[PDB]
Design a protein around this ligand. Structure first.
Ligand SMILES: CCCS(=O)(=O)Nc1ccc(F)c(C(=O)Nc2cnc3n[nH]c(OC)c3c2)c1F
Length: 268
C-alpha cells in the first residue's frame, strides 16, 4: 500500500523550484526524478496527517496527461516526488524561448491539456491554479499537468497567477470560488496563450487595475489578437471558456468535443 520513500534512497541534485509553497529539485530515484520539498521546518502531526491527506488525492491520478506521482517523503523533510520531464514547461516555450509551434501542434497541446482536466474533474479534483507554468511538456510532445496537489495545505498554513483567475476567483469573494468552471476559465486563458503566443492585458502596467477590472468584468482578454491561421470556431470556444458568469462556461467533456471537432477539420 504505502508510497513512502525511506531516507537515503533519493539523491537530490540541481535546483530549479522557486516559491514559498515548496522547492523543486531534480533528482535520482529509479532514474531521474523531480522532488518538491515542501520547505516548511518540522511540522506537528496535525499538519503531518494533513499532508498524508493531500497525497491520498494524488494517488487517485493515473493518466498520460497528468504528471506522474511516484512517491512521498517525510524523514528528511516533507516531499512529493514525480517523474522528471525532459524539455521545458509551456510557459517557457511560448514566453521565454518564443517557440513558434505549427498551428496543428498548438491545437494538439490544447486537446491534451483539455484531456488532462476532464480526467481530473471526473475524479473530482479541482486544479485551482492551472496556468501555462503548470503545464509541462515532455520530450516536446506530451502534456503533463502538475501542481494540482496540496490545495488543503495552502489554507491550513496561510501573488502571480492572477492572469488565469476567473472573475469570481479574482475578487476574493466567498470561502470557495473554486469550481470546475473556475478551472475552465483558467483553461480559456491558456487557449488565449496558445492562439496568440502572448500573455493577456500586456498593455496595462498596474496590477491592481487588472485585478479590479477583471473581477468586475470590465476587462477581459482581447480575442482579436489570434493569428489568421487559427480556426474560426476556436475564437467561439475561448469566448465560451472565458464567460464572466460561471454558469455560461462549458464543462470539459464538451470543451474537448469542440476541440476534436475543429482539430480534424483543419488538415483539409
Ligand atoms: C503530480 C501530482 C503532484 S503535485 O504536487 O500536483 N505536482 C508536483 C509535485 C512535485 C513536483 F516535483 C512537481 C514538479 O513541478 N515537477 C517537475 C518535473 N519534471 C520537470 N522537468 N523540468 C521541470 O522544471 C524545470 C520539472 C518539474 C509537481 F508538479
Amino acid at each position: 500500500d504505502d508510497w513512502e520513500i525511506p531516507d537515503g534512497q533519493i539523491t537530490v541534485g540541481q535546483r530549479i523550484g522557486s516559491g514559498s509553497f515548496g522547492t523543486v529539485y531534480k533528482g535520482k530515484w529509479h532514474g531521474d526524478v523531480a522532488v518538491k520539498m515542501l520547505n516548511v521546518t518540522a511540522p506537528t502531526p496535525q499538519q503531518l496527517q494533513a499532508f498524508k491527506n493531500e497525497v491520498g488525492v494524488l494517488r487517485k491520478t493515473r493518466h498520460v496527461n497528468i504528471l506522474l506521482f511516484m512517491g512521498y517523503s517525510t524523514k528528511p523533510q516533507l516531499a512529493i516526488v514525480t517523474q522528471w520531464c525532459e524539455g521545458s514547461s509551456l510557459y517557457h516555450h511560448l514566453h521565454i524561448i518564443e517557440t513558434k509551434f505549427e498551428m496543428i501542434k498548438l491545437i494538439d497541446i490544447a486537446r491534451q491539456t483539455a484531456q488532462g482536466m476532464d480526467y481530473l474533474h471526473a475524479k473530482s479534483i479541482i486544479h485551482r491554479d492551472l496556468k501555462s507554468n503548470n503545464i509541462f511538456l515532455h520530450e516536446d510532445l506530451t502534456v503533463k499537468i502538475g501542481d494540482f496537489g496540496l490545495a488543503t495545505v495552502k489554507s491550513r498554513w496561510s501573488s502571480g497567477s492572477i492572469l488565469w483567475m476567473a472573475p469570481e476567483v479574482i475578487r476574493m469573494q466567498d470561502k470557495n470560488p473554486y469550481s470546475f468552471q473556475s478551472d475552465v476559465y483558467a483553461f480559456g486563458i491558456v487557449l488565449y496563450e496558445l492562439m496568440t503566443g502572448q500573455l493577456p492585458y500586456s498593455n496595462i502596467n498596474n496590477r491592481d487595475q487588472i485585478i479590479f477590472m477583471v473581477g468586475r468584468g470590465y476587462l477581459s482578454p482581447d480575442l482579436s489578437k489570434v493569428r489568421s491561421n487559427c480556426p474560426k470556431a476556436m475564437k467561439r470556444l475561448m469566448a465560451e471558456c472565458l464567460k464572466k458568469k460561471r454558469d455560461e462556461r462549458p464543462l470539459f467533456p464538451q470543451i474537448l468535443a469542440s476541440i476534436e471537432l475543429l482539430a480534424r477539420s483543419l488538415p483539409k
